[PDB]
Design a protein around this ligand. Structure first.
Ligand SMILES: [Zn+2]
Ligand SMILES: [Zn+2]
Lengths: 230, 231
């Protein structure tokens, strides 16, 4: 219930604040927590089931004696589901998603610091993406992941969380745009070349160059799929 | 039921695509849906309660759950729950929230249309915020809502979606920093004047003026609280 939900949020918040608990730690059993909060065991399980679906909480099987309910504090898919659902209606269009990426990625690139980038993780993603047999959908899923990873160079975790939360809707968007592409082989090749030149600029600390390349990369794909007609 | 969730999402998506239902419309009954989707009544209800939490649907219109459930396709509070928990553990800092607001709010104002924002609604928020007997928690709660309201004036609707998803965290953020303010009466006074001017610029189509004022507004409060910290 609401009472249970808020009681839990306030409780977890205070545990994290005091240091008694840390992200990744297991919560007390439902029996114990429900008594501590003064709420029915039923309303507590429901509140936790919802928090689990949202990503705030996560469950690990086989944890006994530990509860198996972990404080993860992940944004979940709510934001992506809202973006993608709105996209179906006249309320939101592909260009709106495209432009959102430009705003966020542009800011991250502009403020990127070479010593802060998880460059090896990003380059590995690009490694899997060169696989000639790799399906169009998987390639674009890694593509969106790659863009989230390189945005970490700006070391702004909130911006990074927003990027991660939008990841699913970004892939949904590029995948749909790709449907009308005449030659995915050639397109993915150019995208890969651009991805590496972007990563190189970021590695060299050429923030302004990286930002320009990212802008041209995202816009290039958007215009290309528009021409293909989709 | 993970299938109940998928079955419902797929159903809602198609109703929206076909045009039979649009954002804001009511869902049919659970009895009707349970059958149509081939999912137990209990599993269907579990999925709907999650969809409600996700922001996809809502039963808080008319007179509450009694008035039914409508399709909202909104962000919900998930991201804010995440952000505020990370804020508490220092995984995310006040500084990060500040930079993010400047980015999102500035763009929304810079690229807005006077015919797009519901200024009277925003104006009404500022009227409640005028009350000198209003505690700072409530004031700042309305403050965050106000900023989300004016962001809907942006040509890109998604900016307001991101703003809405961040709303509760922004409020948590500003309230936390206000506590240390040596003179809240004076502070809230300058914020209202600044809010009015911002709303005035936007209402008049002065996108560039609005964006500059929002930058100074958000920056002003951040530095002021950054100084008012007891230490
Ligand atoms: Zn890319
Ligand atoms: Zn304000």
């Amino acid at each position: 219930s609401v009472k249970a939900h808020e009681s839990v949020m306030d409780w977890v918040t205070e545990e994290l604040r005091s240091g008694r608990l840390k992200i990744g730690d297991h919560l007390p059993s439902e029996r114990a927590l429900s008594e501590t909060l003064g709420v029915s065991r039923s309303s507590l399980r429901e509140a936790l089931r919802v928090l689990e679906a949202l990503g705030t909480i996560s469950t690990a099987t086989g944890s006994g004696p530990r509860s198996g309910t972990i404080i993860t504090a992940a944004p979940g898919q709510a934001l992506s589901l809202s973006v993608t659902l709105q996209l179906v209606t006249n309320q939101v269009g592909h260009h709106d998603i495209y432009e959102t990426r430009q705003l966020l990625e542009g800011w991250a690139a502009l403020h990127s610091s070479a010593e802060r980038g998880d460059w090896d993780v990003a380059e590995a993603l690009l490694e899997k993406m060169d696989d000639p047999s790799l399906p169009l959908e998987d390639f674009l899923r890694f593509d969106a992941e790659f863009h989230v990873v390189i945005s970490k160079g700006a070391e702004n975790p909130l911006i990074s969380t927003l990027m991660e939360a939008l990841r699913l809707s970004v892939a949904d968007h590029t995948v749909a745009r790709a449907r009308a592409l005449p030659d995915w082989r050639a397109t993915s090749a150019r995208l890969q070349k651009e991805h590496r030149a972007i990563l190189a600029a970021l590695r060299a600390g050429e923030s302004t160059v990286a930002a320009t390349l990212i802008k041209e990369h995202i816009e290039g794909y958007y215009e290309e799929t528009a021409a293909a007609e989709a």
